Amino acid sequence: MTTNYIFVTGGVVSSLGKGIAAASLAAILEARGLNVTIMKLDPYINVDPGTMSPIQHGEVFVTEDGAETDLDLGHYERFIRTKMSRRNNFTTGRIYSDVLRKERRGDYLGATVQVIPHITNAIKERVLEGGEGHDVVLVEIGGTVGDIESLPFLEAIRQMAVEIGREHTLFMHLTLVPYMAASGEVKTKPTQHSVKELLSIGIQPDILICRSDRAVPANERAKIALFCNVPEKAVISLKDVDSIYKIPGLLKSQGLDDYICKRFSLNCPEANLSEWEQVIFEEANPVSEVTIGMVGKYIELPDAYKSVIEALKHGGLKNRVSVNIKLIDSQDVETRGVEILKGLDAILVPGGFGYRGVEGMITTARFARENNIPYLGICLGMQVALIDYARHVANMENANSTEFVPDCKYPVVALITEWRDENGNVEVTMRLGAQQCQLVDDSLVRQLYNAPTIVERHRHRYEVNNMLLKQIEDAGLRVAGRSGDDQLVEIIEVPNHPWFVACQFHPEFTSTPRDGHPLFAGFVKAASEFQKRQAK
């Protein structure tokens, strides 16, 4: 099993759908029984995305193993079965980070450390390390062919190709092909110029995925093929679709996989896109429609909630419900009232950090609870839910979490190390990654999940204060799931509501269009049910 590489680059413009296109291609190949993987090389100095701001960067994906990563890894997982690890994503800064240590520590032997080969060498090592024992490895180069930031990545993959050879390496480049209103036509120039840059640095693309408003007409394609470029019938059209679930099919329709298998000398069964057609079908044929309110502090960048939004969609798939997501700002709530929340068949409070929109969230939770509106809260969203209750259904006077009010009488949520009493009494940090969790017999989730135990992914520090727990419990609230050790609280549920659950983890990083998510499926169904009784 000689490992084969597909280096995926984009030209002309950013935001071309490269992540998704690699994902889709990976999907097809897997559908052919191949052992496939994908990796993301991010051309930025930040050592890890775990510090990038959601606005700008988008959401911070979390792998099983706790790596904080680029959201593209989210796309990968929702398209292929291979699990992502830290090995699947690295940035220009971690490389440098690396090379700078080895240096300042000898390794180089007073030799002069340069981009080439020291940096490039470091890139290859990591690329190999992640391709390690896969039939096909998709290497997605972030940024745009043409930026400097890209340079070292491109040079490294160039080196690889030479080394490894045409028989186990391919270059897949993505270009924009604008449609002209004025021209009333297809502009191929930009692709030519892009391919031109590849050549300028040693790279001759083997495949071209042409992104356009609409399908790129053979004639145009035929032009590109030869037009500079120089590919054969490996010029692919990637029109704008209304559903990403259709991409694997479109690419297949065009022979991309075949081209790829031949080149790689991969003898293998024809791709069966049944699951994808299924997903498409379901999506195309909803029965009912709901409107869900997503109440958070980062709505400027919807990509800040990428995984949630996809999860909601999946939940809809599993119920034949067309979900209408209405993005709402924690703030306005605690500003514009509560009349913004009205008209939601359901309400979701995602994660985030601060204290910023936090008050409006607490509110939202209360509104949901009080108005028997199905509510689902992730992390922050659980916390803001622990509160409202603590506050409104118990004593917990000004109930809060030390993230916001370090000195509260009632710190129902806060670092374990900070666990104190209402009387300041006391007892005798970053949770990242997949973690087992024990569900409470007789709980909603225990039913939804249909298992005693589950594994979910975390990304948090502030825990439920066990010190003020029973106090909230006895107020009626219920603990649905825990995480042994310190038995930390993972899931809570409010007993006298139609559908009210909250968890510490990010159920969203486990949802997929093909298999859904028990929690989201439930939530969505409930939303439906709610819609149904509100009028009938």
Indicate which residues carry an active-site annotation: 379, 506, 508
Alpha-carbon span 386 to 379, nearest angstrom: 10
| Cβ distance to Mg ion smaller for residue 142 or 350 | 142
- Structure tokens that stand for 316 in this block: 């809809």
Q: Residues 13-32 vs its own copies: string with x where CB under 8 A?
A: xxxxx---------------
By C-beta, is 161 or 492 nearer to its own copies?
161
Tell me the closest approach of the beta carbon of residue 110 to its own copies, in angstroms. 3
CB 443 within 8 A of CB 480: yes
117 is in an annotated binding site: no
The set of residues, in sequence order, having a beta carbon less than 8 Å from that of 230 and lying 6+ positions away, is: 195, 204
The answer to whether the CB of 312 falls within 8 A of the CB of 323 is yes
List Cβ neighbours of 161 (8 Å cut-off, separation of 6 or more): 5, 7, 169, 171, 203
The CB-of-176 to its own copies minimum distance in angstroms stands at: 7
The residue within the footprint of its own copies, chosen from 1, 2, 183, 425 (CB under 8 A), is: 183
Applying CB under 8 A, among 86, 93, 334, 338 the residue interacting with its own copies is 93
Looking at the Cβ atoms of 72 and 508, the one nearer to Mg ion is: 72
Which of its own copies, Mg ion, none does residue 183 bind (CB under 5 to 8 Å by kind)?
its own copies
Q: Does the annotation place 223 within a ligand binding site?
A: yes
Q: Which of 41, 38, 4, 35 is nearest to 21 (CA)?
A: 38
- 């609409």: which residue's tokens? 214
Nearest approach in angstroms of CB 187 to its own copies is: 4
The interface with its own copies within residues 106-125 (CB under 8 A) comprises 106, 108-116, 118-119
- Please choose which of Mg ion, its own copies, none residue 19 contacts, taking the beta carbon within 5 to 8 angstroms, the exact cut-off set by kind: Mg ion
Q: Of these, 81, 83, 103, 132, which contacts its own copies (CB under 8 A)?
A: 103
Q: Which helix (H) or strand (E) holds 483?
A: strand 478-483
The pair of structure tokens assigned to 505 is 């983890």
18 binds, among Mg ion, its own copies, none (CB under 5 to 8 A by kind): Mg ion
Taking the least distance from each CB to its own copies, the nearer of 231 and 377 is 231
232 binds its own copies (CB under 8 A): no
Give the nearest distance from C-beta 306 to its own copies in angstroms. Answer: 12
**Binding partner at 516 among its own copies, Mg ion, none, C-beta below 5 to 8 Å by kind:** none
Q: Which stretch binds its own copies (CB under 8 A): 26-34, 173-181, 290-298, 468-476?
A: 173-181
- The encoded tokens of residue 38 equal 């994908």
Gap between the Cα atoms of 364 and 360, Å rounded: 6
Total of chain residues touching Mg ion, rule CB under 5 A: 5
Q: Which two tokens stand for residue 515?
A: 């298999």
Query: Residue 199 and residue 112: Cα distance in Å, rounded?
Result: 29
Range list of H helices, 202-273: 218-226, 247-253, 256-263
189 among the known binding-site residues? Answer: yes
**Residue with the shortest CB distance to Mg ion:** 142
Amino acid (1-letter code) at residue 121:
N
Q: Is 188 annotated as a binding residue?
A: yes
Nearer to its own copies, 85 or 192 (CB): 192
Contact 141, 8 (CB under 8 A): yes
Rounded to a whole number of angstroms, the minimum distance from the CB of residue 69 to Mg ion is: 11
User: Minimum Å distance from CB 234 to its own copies?
Assistant: 15
Half-sphere exposure of 505 (CA within 13 A, CB side): 29
Q: Which stretch binds its own copies (CB under 8 A): 149-157, 348-356, 445-453, 480-488?
A: 149-157
H-helix or E-strand spanning residue 9 = strand 4-10
Contacts of Mg ion in 29-88 (CB under 5 A)? 42, 72
Is 190 annotated in a binding site? The answer is yes
E-strand stretches of 66-182:
68-69, 89-91, 136-144, 169-176
Using CB under 8 A, which of the segments 10-18, 327-335, 375-383, 414-422 binds its own copies? 10-18
Which amino acid is present at 214? R
Cβ contact 57:8 at 8 Å: no
- The answer on whether 383 is annotated among ligand-binding residues is yes
534 binds, among its own copies, Mg ion, none (CB under 5 to 8 A by kind): none
Those residues with Cβ within 8 angstroms of residue 212's Cβ, 6 or more apart along the chain or in another chain? 176, 177, 178, 179, 186, 237, 238, 239, 240
Residue placing its CB nearer to its own copies in the complex, 200 or 272: 200
What are the contacts of 45-48 at 24+ separation with CB within 8 A? 45/91, 45/92, 45/93, 45/96, 46/91, 46/93, 47/91, 47/93, 47/94, 47/97, 48/91, 48/94
Q: Binding site annotation covers 352?
A: yes
Question: Which sign, positive or negative, has the C-alpha torsion 414, 418, 424, 426?
Answer: positive
Give me the residues that bind its own copies (CB under 8 A), please. Answer: 12-17, 43-47, 51-53, 55-57, 93, 96-97, 99-100, 103-104, 106, 108-116, 118-119, 144, 146, 148-149, 151-152, 155, 162, 176, 178, 180-183, 185, 187, 189-190, 193, 196-197, 199-202, 204, 213, 227-228, 230, 240
Binding residues for CTP: 14, 147-149, 187-192, 223
For the annotated binding site for Mg(2+), the residues are: 72, 140
Residues that bind Mg ion (CB under 5 A): 18-19, 42, 72, 142
Annotated binding-site residues for UTP read 14, 187-192, 223
